[PDB]
Amino acid sequence: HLSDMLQQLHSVNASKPSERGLVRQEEAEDPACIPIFWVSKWVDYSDKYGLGYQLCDNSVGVLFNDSTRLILYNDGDSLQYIERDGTESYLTVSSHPNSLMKKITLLKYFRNYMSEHLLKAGANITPREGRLPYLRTWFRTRSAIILHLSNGSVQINFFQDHTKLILCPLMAAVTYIDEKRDFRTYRLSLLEEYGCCKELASRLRYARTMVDKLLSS
């Protein structure tokens, strides 16, 4: 759906959202389109293992350096192992699967690390109701970290001001978290009619540049 997202993002950037006479941004809000999932926190151990992160529902997952991923559901015991080729597998920790003990151990170490050292992004936001997605890929730039989920969502966490973007092409929407940590969701199509502000417009512009990168990989 990365291709569908380049469409929507262009249309709105192509309409000069903030280059309007009167900007009626609040009119573009769509409470129903609130995301189901988004990355709460993350730790970069790619130097030796991979990248750990937590989803807003408290589940945790990791993308290992060997291109395999492991997810631990919020029940604290259910798992989901995805091999490189995308081959999903559903298991249980308590089932004590020898082949995965080392990676389970590492997954819990990230969980413990994020649990005592990091804040939970979007803590003051109730997601709408919905399987669990996994991190497909990710990368950082001098100015932000981009996270691409298996459900098609793309998240961009900006370093400087801590502002965040959560884009979804199924709902064709975007949720913008500002520096006050205010949390809002707009329907791309509407932001094209009613317009939006200057800082939201440039961020969406940066997002198209990030989606381009995601497609060229």
């Binding site: 926190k41 730790v43 804040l119």
Partner: peptide
Amino acid sequence: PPHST
């Protein structure tokens, strides 16, 4: 290592 906020 590098991490989120």
